Amino acid sequence: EDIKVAVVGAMSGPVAQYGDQEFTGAEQAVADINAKGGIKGNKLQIVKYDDACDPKQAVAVANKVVNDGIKYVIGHLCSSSTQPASDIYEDEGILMITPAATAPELTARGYQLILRTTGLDSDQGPTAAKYILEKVKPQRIAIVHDKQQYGEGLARAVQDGLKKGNANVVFFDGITAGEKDFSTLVARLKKENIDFVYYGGYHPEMGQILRQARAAGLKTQFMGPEGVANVSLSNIAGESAEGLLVTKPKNYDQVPANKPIVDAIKAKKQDPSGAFVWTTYAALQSLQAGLNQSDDPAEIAKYLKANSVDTVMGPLTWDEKGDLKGFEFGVFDWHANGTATDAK
Ligand SMILES: CC[C@H](C)[C@H](N)C(=O)O
């Protein structure tokens, strides 16, 4: 009979866009897998859970998944939501594969049932720093973040890499997620003649910062991580998004072999351009490879760590703590278009 797989992410709230990408990828992977026969004739079925990328709700969802008897979780997306949920999953023998959480701490605590189909900010942060030091070469930098594990973690990593390269960081400070009035920020950037800003956070905040900065006549060059590289950023900022530098996973939707998946998704009037469509599809493929060997969570995790799995992201390989080996974030130019081109 049917095999239940929880797909957990932000299906509502300020960053619902992340959940949209996730579900789109999950839905297509499950349809593709079941069309080919499922797991030895057994069909896979997705059970959608909304954690709104809110830590307290992610904890409620984790407990509900356990109580619903589901043993495999594709998900949770935000780092600060994924980590407390992983504590429950590890304690309850539930396999958890996140297609989007990037904070290093998630996998630095000895957990055996946690894996990822995305990279680490201990790689994403230095990639940004290096690019700024080698290609951008700005004169007066400011680093802003939203005080959350993800954003503040990247902000600190970039600050450390810039300090190490003798860059002039004029200020480092956080703002509150949810904030829409960035007038004092814009004024400080203007007053202190800041030509470059790295923002560690998500698209709702980045979008407003960009609009207001441009409305105030600022020519400052901004840069942000993959949490900012999506169509919702472009919809919020409009023309203020052109010029934005971002670090993000490769454009898997442009890999020729993936075209059928792209066409199938477009065919449903869904967006196949978001990175989490692909990291999530890949997570389902990883779960598929393991379910073909065993239905036990620890055996699946052990199997995946000992064997590569071919996916829409290419062949994935994991280390003993559950991280992808050799994953790389690229640096791109984002456009009001909602598209990304490799930065020079
Ligand atoms: C959707 C994931 C977000 C963008 C970020 N990578 C995090 O770990 O919170």
CSV table of all heavy atoms in Angstrom, one decimal, residues 18 53 77-80 100-103 118 121 124 150-151 201-202 226-228 276, ligand 1:
chain,number,residue,atom,x,y,z
A,18,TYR,N,8.9,30.2,-0.3
A,18,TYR,CA,9.8,29.0,-0.1
A,18,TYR,C,8.9,27.7,-0.2
A,18,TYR,O,9.3,26.8,-0.8
A,18,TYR,CB,10.5,29.1,1.3
A,18,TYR,CG,11.4,30.3,1.4
A,18,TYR,CD1,11.7,30.8,2.7
A,18,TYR,CD2,12.0,30.9,0.3
A,18,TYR,CE1,12.5,31.9,2.8
A,18,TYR,CE2,12.8,32.0,0.4
A,18,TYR,CZ,13.1,32.5,1.7
A,18,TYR,OH,14.0,33.6,1.9
A,53,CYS,N,7.4,28.6,8.5
A,53,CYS,CA,8.8,29.0,8.9
A,53,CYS,C,8.8,29.8,10.2
A,53,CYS,O,9.5,30.7,10.4
A,53,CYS,CB,9.4,29.9,7.8
A,53,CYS,SG,10.4,29.0,6.6
A,77,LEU,N,12.2,24.1,6.0
A,77,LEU,CA,13.0,25.0,5.1
A,77,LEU,C,13.9,26.0,5.9
A,77,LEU,O,15.1,26.0,5.6
A,77,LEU,CB,12.0,25.7,4.2
A,77,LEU,CG,11.4,25.1,2.9
A,77,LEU,CD1,11.6,23.7,2.8
A,77,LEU,CD2,9.9,25.6,2.7
A,78,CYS,N,13.3,26.8,6.7
A,78,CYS,CA,14.1,27.8,7.5
A,78,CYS,C,14.9,27.1,8.5
A,78,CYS,O,14.5,26.2,9.2
A,78,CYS,CB,13.1,28.9,8.0
A,78,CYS,SG,12.3,29.8,6.7
A,79,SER,N,16.2,27.6,8.7
A,79,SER,CA,17.1,27.0,9.7
A,79,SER,C,16.5,27.1,11.1
A,79,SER,O,16.6,26.1,11.8
A,79,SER,CB,18.4,27.7,9.6
A,79,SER,OG,19.1,27.3,8.4
A,80,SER,N,16.0,28.2,11.5
A,80,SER,CA,15.5,28.3,12.9
A,80,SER,C,14.3,27.5,13.2
A,80,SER,O,14.0,27.3,14.3
A,80,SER,CB,15.3,29.8,13.3
A,80,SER,OG,14.4,30.4,12.4
A,100,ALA,N,16.4,22.8,2.1
A,100,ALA,CA,16.7,24.2,2.1
A,100,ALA,C,17.4,24.9,3.3
A,100,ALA,O,17.9,26.0,3.2
A,100,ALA,CB,15.4,25.0,1.8
A,101,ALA,N,17.4,24.2,4.4
A,101,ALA,CA,18.1,24.7,5.6
A,101,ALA,C,19.6,24.7,5.5
A,101,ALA,O,20.2,23.6,5.2
A,101,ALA,CB,17.7,23.9,6.9
A,102,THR,N,20.2,25.9,5.6
A,102,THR,CA,21.7,26.0,5.4
A,102,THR,C,22.6,26.3,6.6
A,102,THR,O,23.8,26.2,6.4
A,102,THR,CB,21.9,27.0,4.3
A,102,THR,OG1,21.3,28.3,4.7
A,102,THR,CG2,21.3,26.6,2.9
A,103,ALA,N,22.0,26.6,7.7
A,103,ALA,CA,22.8,26.9,8.9
A,103,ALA,C,23.6,25.7,9.3
A,103,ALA,O,23.1,24.6,9.4
A,103,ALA,CB,21.9,27.3,10.1
A,118,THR,N,20.8,20.6,0.2
A,118,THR,CA,21.3,21.9,-0.1
A,118,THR,C,22.6,22.1,0.6
A,118,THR,O,23.0,21.2,1.3
A,118,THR,CB,20.3,23.1,0.3
A,118,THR,OG1,20.8,24.3,-0.2
A,118,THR,CG2,20.3,23.1,1.9
A,121,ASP,N,26.0,27.3,5.0
A,121,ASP,CA,26.4,28.7,5.0
A,121,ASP,C,27.9,28.9,5.3
A,121,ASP,O,28.4,29.9,5.1
A,121,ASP,CB,25.5,29.5,5.9
A,121,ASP,CG,24.1,29.5,5.3
A,121,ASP,OD1,24.0,29.6,4.1
A,121,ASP,OD2,23.1,29.5,6.1
A,124,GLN,N,28.5,29.2,1.8
A,124,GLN,CA,27.8,30.3,1.1
A,124,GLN,C,28.4,31.7,1.6
A,124,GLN,O,28.6,32.5,0.8
A,124,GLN,CB,26.3,30.2,1.4
A,124,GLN,CG,25.6,31.3,0.5
A,124,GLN,CD,24.1,31.1,0.4
A,124,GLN,OE1,23.4,31.7,-0.5
A,124,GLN,NE2,23.5,30.4,1.4
A,150,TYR,N,19.8,32.0,10.3
A,150,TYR,CA,20.3,32.0,8.9
A,150,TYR,C,21.0,33.3,8.6
A,150,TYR,O,22.1,33.3,8.2
A,150,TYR,CB,19.1,31.8,8.0
A,150,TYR,CG,19.4,32.0,6.5
A,150,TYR,CD1,20.2,31.1,5.8
A,150,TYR,CD2,18.8,33.1,5.8
A,150,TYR,CE1,20.4,31.3,4.5
A,150,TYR,CE2,19.1,33.3,4.5
A,150,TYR,CZ,19.9,32.3,3.8
A,150,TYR,OH,20.0,32.4,2.4
A,151,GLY,N,20.2,34.4,8.6
A,151,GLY,CA,20.7,35.7,8.2
A,151,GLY,C,21.9,36.2,9.0
A,151,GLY,O,22.9,36.7,8.5
A,201,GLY,N,19.6,37.5,5.1
A,201,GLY,CA,18.2,37.4,5.4
A,201,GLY,C,17.4,36.9,4.3
A,201,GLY,O,17.9,36.2,3.4
A,202,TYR,N,16.1,37.1,4.4
A,202,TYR,CA,15.1,36.7,3.4
A,202,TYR,C,14.5,37.8,2.6
A,202,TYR,O,14.7,39.0,2.9
A,202,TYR,CB,13.9,36.0,4.2
A,202,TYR,CG,14.3,34.9,5.1
A,202,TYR,CD1,13.8,34.8,6.4
A,202,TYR,CD2,15.3,33.9,4.7
A,202,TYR,CE1,14.1,33.7,7.2
A,202,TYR,CE2,15.6,32.9,5.5
A,202,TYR,CZ,15.1,32.7,6.8
A,202,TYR,OH,15.4,31.6,7.5
A,226,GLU,N,20.9,33.0,-1.0
A,226,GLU,CA,19.9,32.4,-1.8
A,226,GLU,C,18.4,32.7,-1.3
A,226,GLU,O,17.5,32.6,-2.0
A,226,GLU,CB,20.1,30.9,-2.0
A,226,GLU,CG,19.2,30.0,-1.2
A,226,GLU,CD,19.6,29.9,0.3
A,226,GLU,OE1,20.6,30.5,0.7
A,226,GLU,OE2,18.9,29.1,1.0
A,227,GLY,N,18.3,33.0,0.0
A,227,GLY,CA,17.0,33.3,0.6
A,227,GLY,C,16.3,34.6,0.0
A,227,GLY,O,15.1,34.9,0.1
A,228,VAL,N,17.1,35.3,-0.8
A,228,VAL,CA,16.7,36.5,-1.4
A,228,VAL,C,16.6,36.4,-3.0
A,228,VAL,O,16.0,37.3,-3.6
A,228,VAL,CB,17.8,37.6,-1.0
A,228,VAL,CG1,18.2,38.4,-2.1
A,228,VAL,CG2,17.3,38.4,0.2
A,276,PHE,N,14.4,25.8,-4.8
A,276,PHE,CA,13.9,24.7,-3.9
A,276,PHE,C,13.0,23.7,-4.7
A,276,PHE,O,12.6,22.7,-4.1
A,276,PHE,CB,13.3,25.3,-2.7
A,276,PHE,CG,14.2,26.3,-1.9
A,276,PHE,CD1,13.7,27.4,-1.4
A,276,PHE,CD2,15.5,26.0,-1.9
A,276,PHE,CE1,14.5,28.3,-0.7
A,276,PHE,CE2,16.4,26.9,-1.2
A,276,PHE,CZ,15.9,28.0,-0.6
B,1,LIG,C1,14.4,28.5,2.6
B,1,LIG,C2,15.7,28.4,3.4
B,1,LIG,C3,16.2,29.7,3.9
B,1,LIG,C4,16.3,30.6,2.6
B,1,LIG,C5,17.7,29.6,4.5
B,1,LIG,N1,18.5,28.7,3.6
B,1,LIG,C6,17.5,29.0,5.9
B,1,LIG,O1,18.2,28.0,6.2
B,1,LIG,O2,16.8,29.6,6.7
